Amino acid sequence: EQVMMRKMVRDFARKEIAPAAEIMEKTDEFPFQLIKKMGKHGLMGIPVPEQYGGAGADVVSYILAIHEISRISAAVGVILSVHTSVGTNPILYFGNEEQKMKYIPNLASGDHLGAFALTEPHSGSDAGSLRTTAIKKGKYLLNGSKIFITNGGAADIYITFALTAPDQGRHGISAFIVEKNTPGFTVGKKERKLGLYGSNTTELIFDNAEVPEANLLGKEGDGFHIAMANLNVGRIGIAAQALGIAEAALEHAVDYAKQRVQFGRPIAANQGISFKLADMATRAEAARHLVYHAADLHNGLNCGKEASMAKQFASDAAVKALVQIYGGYGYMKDYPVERLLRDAKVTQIYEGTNEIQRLIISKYLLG
Amino acid sequence: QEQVMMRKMVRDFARKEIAPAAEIMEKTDEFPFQLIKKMGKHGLMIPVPEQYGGAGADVVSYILAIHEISRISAAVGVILSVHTSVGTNPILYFGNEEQKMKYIPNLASGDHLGAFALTEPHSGSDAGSLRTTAIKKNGKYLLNGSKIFITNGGAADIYITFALTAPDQGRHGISAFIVEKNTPGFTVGKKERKLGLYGSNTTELIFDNAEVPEANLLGKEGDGFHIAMANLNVGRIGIAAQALGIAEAALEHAVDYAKQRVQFGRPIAANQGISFKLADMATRAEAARHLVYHAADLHNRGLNCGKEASMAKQFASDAAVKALDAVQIYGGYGYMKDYPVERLLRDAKVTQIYEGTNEIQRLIISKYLLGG
Amino acid sequence: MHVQEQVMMRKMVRDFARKEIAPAAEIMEKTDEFPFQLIKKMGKHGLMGIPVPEQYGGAGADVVSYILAIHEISRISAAVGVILSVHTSVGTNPILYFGNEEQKMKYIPNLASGDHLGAFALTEPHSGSDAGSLRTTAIKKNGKYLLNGSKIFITNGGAADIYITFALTAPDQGRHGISAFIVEKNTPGFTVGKKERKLGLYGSNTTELIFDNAEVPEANLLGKEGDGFHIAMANLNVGRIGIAAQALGIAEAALEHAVDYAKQRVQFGRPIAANQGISFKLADMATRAEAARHLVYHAADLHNRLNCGKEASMAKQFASDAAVKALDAVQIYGGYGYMKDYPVERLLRDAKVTQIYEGTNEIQRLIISKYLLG
Amino acid sequence: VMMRKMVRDFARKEIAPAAEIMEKTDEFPFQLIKKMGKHGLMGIPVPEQYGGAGADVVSYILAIHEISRISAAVGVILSVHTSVGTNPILYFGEEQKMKYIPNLASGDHLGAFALTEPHSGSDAGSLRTTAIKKNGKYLLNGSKIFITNGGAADIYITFALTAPDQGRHGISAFIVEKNTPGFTVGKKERKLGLYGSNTTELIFDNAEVPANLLGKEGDGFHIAMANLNVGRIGIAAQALGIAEAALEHAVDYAKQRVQFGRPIAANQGISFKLADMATRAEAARHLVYHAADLHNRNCGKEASMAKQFASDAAVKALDVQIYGGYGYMKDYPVERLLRDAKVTQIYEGTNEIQRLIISKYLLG
Ligand SMILES: Cc1cc2nc3c(=O)[nH]c(=O)nc-3n(C[C@H](O)[C@H](O)[C@H](O)COP(=O)(O)OP(=O)(O)OC[C@H]3O[C@@H](n4cnc5c(N)ncnc54)[C@H](O)[C@@H]3O)c2cc1C
Ligand SMILES: Cc1cc2nc3c(=O)[nH]c(=O)nc-3n(C[C@H](O)[C@H](O)[C@H](O)COP(=O)(O)OP(=O)(O)OC[C@H]3O[C@@H](n4cnc5c(N)ncnc54)[C@H](O)[C@@H]3O)c2cc1C
Ligand SMILES: Cc1cc2nc3c(=O)[nH]c(=O)nc-3n(C[C@H](O)[C@H](O)[C@H](O)COP(=O)(O)OP(=O)(O)OC[C@H]3O[C@@H](n4cnc5c(N)ncnc54)[C@H](O)[C@@H]3O)c2cc1C
Ligand SMILES: Cc1cc2nc3c(=O)[nH]c(=O)nc-3n(C[C@H](O)[C@H](O)[C@H](O)COP(=O)(O)OP(=O)(O)OC[C@H]3O[C@@H](n4cnc5c(N)ncnc54)[C@H](O)[C@@H]3O)c2cc1C
Structure with missing residues (x-):
């Protein structure tokens, strides 16, 4: 179910989200045509049950989707993330049977946002x-x-x-x-x-x-x-957004790395550079597990502390990408890394600033 | 005195002229031809001798200018910094008497860029x-x-x-x-x-x-x-000064906002989560300040300044990028183009990259350490 | 260490640890003498050949259970953790995995029992x-x-x-x-x-x-x-996960001690914990320890089930560095933390080793980077 | 006319052997102290009236800096003796000054x-x-x-x-x-x-x-x-000396030690640490001396900044690492620097306190 979701979302992402994302960076216009399409392809109500017109999946699959989409576009990732986790789920989880039936199917399908x-x-x-x-x-x-x-x-x-x-x-x-x-x-x-x-x-x-x-x-x-x-499930999503951001930074950074030659050797041959890449990869493996264990807990379990940890870790880790490895080129809007920094910084701020998250975490400890 | 006077002079100018121009630059993305001209008339275009038509001042004063201008605008700071240190100085220091005379006065006045x-x-x-x-x-x-x-x-x-x-x-x-x-x-x-x-x-x-x-x-x-x-040495101290100004702007803005902004019944500053950032910002800015000015004081004394300039560039630049914090201290509002901190991040990151990436700077520094 | 079972091992080692390893550990810090008697005892209690099969005289358990043990023991004593870790992973396993049937039989049972070290x-x-x-x-x-x-x-x-x-x-x-x-x-x-x-x-x-x-x-x-x-x-791969588990235990000890002290210790009319300067360290400690935990156990789960080399390098480097970052614990105890009679100063001294042996963290980043650039 | 040179020579000659005895014995260096007394190192920023090298606060802090390269322990003993054991009398205390200070200054008293x-x-x-x-x-x-x-x-x-x-x-x-x-x-x-x-x-x-x-x-x-203000600049100077010792040792070892066919220094993983160490030591140096120059010529915020910066920078000579396994060894000279370093973050006002103090100047 999950391995299939991942592959489905990866292919969609690369095919449909990738062109749309460049238009978004250029235009700054909400991708109305994309959202619609994602709707048809059954991405807009993933952890919603089928009863109410969604995909009938979990949670890990849903967070997984957001992770994958955020590799290509953090913007689209947060749109999807908000839509479901705090735009749809409050109805799903606290609303009554009548309201669920009135409001969710259109949310699920993506006919409504x-x-x-x-x-x-x-x-x-x-x-x-x-x-x-x-x-x-x-x-x-x-x-x-x-x-x-x-x-x-x-x-x-x-x-x-x-x-x-x-x-x-x-x-x-x-x-x-x-x-x-x-x-x-x-x-x-x-x-x-x-x-x-x-x-x-x-x-x-x-x-x-x-x-x-x-x-x-x-x-x-x-x-x-x-x-x-x-906001708990929402925060895991934000963490997954931060994760995708960070992976995109890494993958781009490696490939550039690698190809780019100075001083007669590819820049990657320098430990100054390679060590960053390793650090990036290591903190991304750390982040990955925080995110997915948090989502696995939520998939009847108290998950609040774990979700705070994930949000804070992935977000901070992601900002740590920073552009540098691309050098001058990385400072350029025509190249794909500058957006990752700009986008990254948000992740430390919304759905609970990292100051708040540390506070929350600390409250569990001092309990 | 000359220096204390330069600093006040550049502070006042920056504030009355550079500040409005800077907002137009952030909106238009257009080179500030008029401001440059004006800066030219006001004798900012500094470490050139009077013989060749400049202000006849020293390198501290000059770097001190770049520092202050960069508080308000990092862009205008680098334009100035490049123009002098690597656009004018190479002629001044390696060029011949004829070339100095032909090219520098127009550069100095600001008639030429x-x-x-x-x-x-x-x-x-x-x-x-x-x-x-x-x-x-x-x-x-x-x-x-x-x-x-x-x-x-x-x-x-x-x-x-x-x-x-x-x-x-x-x-x-x-x-x-x-x-x-x-x-x-x-x-x-x-x-x-x-x-x-x-x-x-x-x-x-x-x-x-x-x-x-x-x-x-x-x-x-x-x-x-x-x-x-x-x-590029004197250029790097200038970049460092740019990074310094950026960082000081982040701090000042952050302090003021943090004092005024109330949440949980207190100003956000009352929280050690927040105040401690401010202190760290201030401390690393005090650190940076001395690296920059001692580096420039070495160069002013005709002395070997290469290692010190590398240290300054790398320190100030990295310290400045660490005003991701300022964005954080405002934020959500800090993520907004109408507010004055998001530019500091965007601008900051360049300081780690040009006139010798910080990877190169560490390399250079390490070369002094290893000797030999 | 989730998601069995392995819940029995963890409780068994936790109880043993607290009862037998705790007093021995204070003697070790004072005397600097190898804990011959504890080892012997750990031997009787079936801790000395945990991922060894029963055929050759061990506990017949898996590698998660084993690493789990090392994690738990290292909460109380990093020293005893490494002694165990080396004994098994690089003192006994090389025979187990590369040795011949005759050698396995000759050498392992005594190693497994703990009659031999x-x-x-x-x-x-x-x-x-x-x-x-x-x-x-x-x-x-x-x-x-x-x-x-x-x-x-x-x-x-x-x-x-x-x-x-x-x-x-x-x-x-x-x-x-x-x-x-x-x-x-x-x-x-x-x-x-x-x-x-x-x-x-x-x-x-x-x-x-x-x-x-x-x-x-x-x-x-x-x-x-x-x-x-x-x-x-x-x-050395399985060894490095063990070193990571050691670093983990160290870090958790730092945290738990730091929380307890910070709650009790009063200055300026309020417990020190009420200060974000302090609480935020605790949260960071806890967060990096959750991060570390999963790196360790997933690495050990890979090995239990596959190629695990990169994951083990990541764990060793992450947990080790994270652990050295306590050092916050010392700070949180303040002056008292600088004191040999108090329990945090050893965590720093001990921590730093974890960055160095079974492959320095410079080497680990190098290794990791080699998988990336592949 | 600022020596250093005097304290550097003394340090290297007299303080170096004593320091190895202190690390082995854990015994207060009574004999060294006495000697430092005869060589006019006890009482440096004390006036000559009260017996008294008659020197200024830079030359004093400078001394502590230099001594701490070699020891740290001896550095803090000196630092406490003068700045908080002698100076309170000197600055807040004519009869008492006369009675108590000369013996403190000479080093006959501690x-x-x-x-x-x-x-x-x-x-x-x-x-x-x-x-x-x-x-x-x-x-x-x-x-x-x-x-x-x-x-x-x-x-x-x-x-x-x-x-x-x-x-x-x-x-x-x-x-x-x-x-x-x-x-x-x-x-x-x-x-x-x-x-x-x-x-x-x-x-x-x-x-x-x-x-x-x-x-x-x-x-x-x-x-x-x-x-405690002048005391804190001293602690910062202690942290500085510690850090410089870490660096100098680390450079020399890294140049000589060969692995993989090249000296370990040739690796950016390693060299970059050295550069960072050197850079943060240059940063620290100026914080310390400008703080002491302010006090010489008020200085509270700057002294807090120095204490916190140098101390934290010094602890960052965990980068022990460069010596590798050898660095974990008591016979080698870097393990002490870590153990010693950590104290600098704690006493004469923990770094939590220092940030607090600093932040109070900002918010005021
Ligand atoms: C705002 C701006 C203004 C500029 N102005 C000017 C100007 O006026 N004049 C001018 O000539 N140029 C200018 N440049 C170009 C600038 O100096 C270069 O970007 C810089 O020298 C690095 O070049 P690069 O972008 O190719 O990075 P590269 O040299 O491609 O390097 C990419 C990455 O690899 C690292 N790297 C490469 N080799 C090594 C090694 N051996 N060891 C360690 N790390 C290594 C770098 O540190 C960097 O992280 C400017 C650039 C910018 C962004
Ligand atoms: C792109 C974007 C989209 C957003 N979308 C939404 C949305 O869809 N729905 C929604 O509800 N909100 C949304 N937000 C708002 C976001 O949740 C809040 O902005 C955030 O909680 C910070 O609040 P603030 O902006 O009022 O600034 P403040 O909360 O005043 O934050 C300023 C600083 O104060 C700190 N802080 C405040 N109190 C404390 C304390 N007790 N301890 C420690 N630190 C503290 C924070 O660390 C921060 O650095 C969005 C923001 C952005 C940028
Ligand atoms: C080797 C050594 C020598 C010493 N020599 C002397 C000496 O000669 N003379 C002398 O007078 N003293 C001396 N001291 C004592 C030293 O001054 C104290 O350790 C220090 O001032 C704090 O005391 P404490 O250990 O009780 O820490 P505590 O005050 O209990 O503080 C512990 C932790 O809580 C934090 N904290 C507490 N309140 C706050 C707050 N409001 N905000 C933020 N954080 C807070 C601190 O940052 C610290 O991390 C020495 C200590 C040592 C270790
Ligand atoms: C508590 C303890 C227990 C030990 N137990 C054992 C044991 O059971 N069995 C055993 O065989 N050994 C053991 N050792 C030795 C240990 O494994 C070595 O110290 C370790 O392998 C590193 O080698 P080294 O000490 O020569 O330092 P070096 O490897 O020379 O390294 C010095 C520094 O330079 C770095 N370095 C060197 N070359 C490179 C490079 N090419 N790239 C990047 N960085 C580099 C290292 O990262 C290190 O920081 C132990 C050591 C200690 C401290």
């Missing part, structure tokens, strides 16, 4: 201190703003978090299935970022936004728990 | 193995081949160009040439699209039976490799 | 990293091989009864003319040097060996002449 | 600094040793720990709680003499390294201290930290 609306200008690490309010009068009425929202403006469904009980803090947060055509719900301009060219990261404005009471992702007050619960 | 042509598709780190030939025919040298990754490319009026006069001698058969931009058969390639240094024109150069006057031969035939490396 | 004899003053360029000669004469030259830095030196010894047959062939020999300790002309005084692994006996027309029986030739280099490296 | 306690270290403010005046003689009670120069020392600059309800603000500083009634020294500690710099516990049992009150009551915390 998923988003995760947690972060706010004032709340972003301290996600507990979010300010968006949801006041009920069988219609919830949402007010406030989100920031840095992956899949912004492409997305049809936004899993959105909003205060139902403001005088409780982290405990008074509820979670909502928000549809894109919601009356006072607006999307901000595409944010201009260091990297993940292609992605589509936007602000969201909620102005007395009318969200149906039935779209409450239940029950009221559970939202903070819902968020973090999924 | 300087470039340094060494690197080639097949020759970079191993600069010895360059392939551009210069064959004397008819009292004119006749240049053939190509250069790559040339800073100041297409803006520059003078290109200090290195080319084989004696191909069978390898590194020992390289000569150095004062090439003028309007030279027959000398052509400039398209602006290269880079990770960073946004405003700084980096281009290819095509030499097609390019006719260079015999009188533009810079020093004796075969001296070119020595000339190159000799200046 | 094993050693590895490769390194020489002039050949270490470049083990190929060893100079000890083995010249067949009379009715006997005749060995000449010297070994250095030999773990289990003077305690050991059997020394798996490598010597030139074969001088004009370099690395291809090396042979391997089962050398017994009471061999005429074979002498042991004084106990070497080391930074750490107190007291894992490390000695010089002098070979003076040393008379080794032809029947003690381990496999075919010229196979010795191959035999050495082949085992 | 100096110590008694701040740290089992319960107070990094948080030195929360010390528990009490000093209660009864009547007109102070009466000291409690314990110190980890005291450099312990049992060799004649004078102990001791800190002790004159106003217990004021915490950090109720600490006083005392000139304690070794023959004081009720003042006892604990057993030699036995450490990872700095073999044998005597490090001991001190027991204060109704210990009778006179006029030996150092400055005004309540000033003790300020006195301590004030000196």
Whole structure:
């Protein structure tokens, strides 16, 4: 199942994702035609059961997919990763049978695209201190703003978090299935970022936004728990993204390595260079196992600490690629390594900054 | 005094002129022709003597300029750095009295802009193995081949160009040439699209039976490799200073943001996870500062400074790239082009690569250690 | 070490370790004397031939269980961990894997039981990293091989009864003319040097060996002449996973001690752990130890099930370097960590070895890089 | 006119043999100290008035740097003696200066600094040793720990709680003499390294201290930290010397030692370490000397930076590795450098504290 998934995703990736990725780096435009295709090829709901219209696979297979896709494109990797793990799964895992049946099949097929609306200008690490309010009068009425929202403006469904009980803090947060055509719900301009060219990261404005009471992702007050619960599987995905990034750095670096001659010998013949390659390879084998064991735990097990470790390790390891080995050429947009640095750095920041991850990890230890 | 005055003068200029220009450069990716001109009028274009039309100041003052300019703009810092250290100085130090007089005043004033042509598709780190030939025919040298990754490319009026006069001698058969931009058969390639240094024109150069006057031969035939490396030393201290400025900008921005930004009921700075980064940044910037200025003080005293300059380049550069932290301290906001830290990373990484990759620098340093 | 079973071995070694190895280890740190009595005991408790089959008088277990043992023992004592590791992986296994049925029967049961102790004899003053360029000669004469030259830095030196010894047959062939020999300790002309005084692994006996027309029986030739280099490296792979497991145990001890101390120790009105300066080290320690764990056990799972050389190199380098990074543990105890009466200072001293023997980390990166550039 | 040259020659001639005896014996080098005394190395930044080489703080720190190339142990003994055993008297202490310093300066007397306690270290403010005046003689009670120069020392600059309800603000500083009634020294500690710099516990049992009150009551915390600044530059200089010894040894060995048909140095794996070592030692050198030049000519942030940088850089002479198996051996000269190095990250303010302090200047 898994060996087959990997080969399927590798071939698709190389054939379809590779050309699209170069267009994304050049255009900075969300790959609407690619997403669609990935949808037809059954990539958009991989750890979703067949009941609700997905591929009926796991978890390792799903994370595996994200790993493989991220080799070729970190952007597409995060789009897929968010879509499923925090755009679809919250419904799958905390939603009711009616909602699962209404919302997931279109998400699974890829006819619909998923988003995760947690972060706010004032709340972003301290996600507990979010300010968006949801006041009920069988219609919830949402007010406030989100920031840095992956899949912004492409997305049809936004899993959105909003205060139902403001005088409780982290405990008074509820979670909502928000549809894109919601009356006072607006999307901000595409944010201009260091990297993940292609992605589509936007602000969201909620102005007395009318969200149906039935779209409450239940029950009221559970939202903070819902968020973090999924962010765990999400973080393994980010780690897998970081992994793919790092492998792409390595493979490119080896081949260039190797071919490129200076001082009468290929640059690789120099230990200054070869030792980097080995270090890259070693930290990538380290990262690999952190990621897949974390995903194997989740595939009924407490996996939170392991997922934090993976995210932090892979991300930091990935940034450690750095461009240098390509030399001057590596500083060039026409060559394939400069993107890996730009893209890498994100991995240390979102779905929980590495400062937070160390904090979380340390909390398990001091337990 | 001269130095303390230079520093304040360059700080004020940078801030009023270089700061607006720098944002235009990050948006347009266009060489800042106007700023350069202005910098020219304000006598920044520094370690040249007054005889030949410069500011008559010393190397510390000059490096100190590059440092300060690089706080605001690494791009403008390298353009300046190249122009002087490797576009102007080779003439100043190895050229003859006639050439000094002909070429330098316009370079010094900033009426003319300087470039340094060494690197080639097949020759970079191993600069010895360059392939551009210069064959004397008819009292004119006749240049053939190509250069790559040339800073100041297409803006520059003078290109200090290195080319084989004696191909069978390898590194020992390289000569150095004062090439003028309007030279027959000398052509400039398209602006290269880079990770960073946004405003700084980096281009290819095509030499097609390019006719260079015999009188533009810079020093004796075969001296070119020595000339190159000799200046690359002062050039490397400048790169280090660039890396320093980059790093200081990262720090200052990071401190301010970290003080103001509140999460968990406290400013983010109150967290040792964060504050400790800042301290590390500050400490490695204090380390870097002294490497740079002692290296420049050695050179100012006419002394052997090669090893120290390598150390500075490698230290500051690596330390600067370590303002991945600044991005982190802002971030998500740090990942955003509207905020001022993402450029520092993009710009930082180059410092590890050009005027001698840090692999080369460690190699060089190690060669001093081993002797012998 | 997941995903059996092997859960029984781990508990068995953990209990033994804590009960018997712990007191012995404090004596070793104080005395610097090889723990003859512990070894004996470990022998009775069936720890001395774990991945040896039952046929030849061992425990009949697999390589994960074995490496697992070494991991557990090294939590308490890195010294005793290496003594065990060498004994089995390079003192007993070369016979097991390359020796003949008669030799296996003669030499292994006593090694397996722990009645006899094993050693590895490769390194020489002039050949270490470049083990190929060893100079000890083995010249067949009379009715006997005749060995000449010297070994250095030999773990289990003077305690050991059997020394798996490598010597030139074969001088004009370099690395291809090396042979391997089962050398017994009471061999005429074979002498042991004084106990070497080391930074750490107190007291894992490390000695010089002098070979003076040393008379080794032809029947003690381990496999075919010229196979010795191959035999050495082949085992050094399983050996390196063991060294990695040693580094792992070291690192986990650093962590566990560091956590406990950091929670209890109060300064500025709060436990030191409440400071991110401190907690973040702990998290890093824990994270790199999870990373290391998987490198080690997957490497050993490959070997249990395949080509494992690259993975073993990765593990050895990763765990070793990670381990030296405690050193944070010393720091976390503060002044007290610099003290011989407290339990962290030994972890540093011990750690550093793990970067050096059974193939320095410079060599390991080289090896790894050779698989990449292939 | 700055020697070095004097301290380098002395070091190599006298300190080198002594240092090998110290590593073997773990015994405080009483005879060397005496000699260093005669050669005018004890009291370097002390004025001549008080007996006194009459030199400046660069020349002093320079001395410590040079000595630490060869020893570390001897370096810290000297460093504590002067910067925190003698200087507190010199800077906070006319009658007392005259009584106590000349013997300290000459090296007839040896100096110590008694701040740290089992319960107070990094948080030195929360010390528990009490000093209660009864009547007109102070009466000291409690314990110190980890005291450099312990049992060799004649004078102990001791800190002790004159106003217990004021915490950090109720600490006083005392000139304690070794023959004081009720003042006892604990057993030699036995450490990872700095073999044998005597490090001991001190027991204060109704210990009778006179006029030996150092400055005004309540000033003790300020006195301590004030000196700990110059002390920290010294520690940095110690870390520097350690690092330079690692480098020089590593270069020579790496050039001579042949494997794979070429000297090990020919390998970039190895050479690159050497270069990094050299580069971080040049970095460290300037941090140290600029910090000391500031103090000579305030200097707190720079001294913290130096201590942290040099110390961490020095520990990074784990790169032992270059000597290989030989480096793990007590007969070879690099294993000591690691063992010794680690201390430099810990005492006179752990590097966690130093980052904290530095960060306080940044955020202020
Ligand atoms: C491309 C992109 C896409 C994103 N997509 C989404 C999305 O789809 N959904 C979503 O919810 N969010 C998204 N984010 C937001 C991201 O989750 C947050 O930005 C992140 O948690 C950091 O929050 P912040 O941006 O408010 O900055 P802050 O959290 O203020 O971080 C600044 C610094 O503070 C540190 N920090 C803060 N508190 C502590 C503490 N207690 N201990 C130690 N360190 C601390 C962090 O290490 C960091 O370096 C995205 C961001 C980016 C760049
Ligand atoms: C912004 C920028 C501006 C520039 N400006 C100029 C200019 O004004 N004039 C000019 O001539 N050139 C310029 N260059 C070119 C620059 O100096 C070169 O990129 C540099 O010398 C290395 O050349 P390379 O890119 O081919 O790297 P290569 O020489 O191909 O080397 C690639 C990698 O291999 C390593 N390597 C190669 N050989 C060895 C060895 N023996 N040991 C260890 N490591 C080795 C390098 O360290 C590097 O990691 C510029 C480049 C940039 C990016
Ligand atoms: C060989 C030796 C000689 C010595 N000589 C002397 C001497 O002559 N005179 C003298 O006065 N003292 C001396 N000391 C004592 C030394 O000053 C102390 O060890 C040190 O100040 C800290 O004390 P501690 O060991 O209790 O560490 P603790 O204060 O318990 O701290 C332990 C750990 O917690 C961390 N920590 C605690 N609080 C914080 C915080 N708020 N933020 C971040 N991190 C924190 C520290 O970084 C450290 O890693 C000596 C020590 C040794 C080992
Ligand atoms: C506790 C301990 C136990 C030991 N046990 C045994 C044992 O049981 N059996 C046994 O045979 N031996 C044993 N040894 C010896 C040990 O294996 C050697 O020290 C090791 O093989 C390295 O060789 P070396 O000591 O000569 O240093 P060298 O190999 O000369 O190396 C010196 C340094 O240079 C590096 N180096 C050398 N050449 C190269 C190169 N081409 N590329 C990159 N780096 C290079 C090394 O990485 C090292 O850092 C032991 C040593 C110790 C300390």
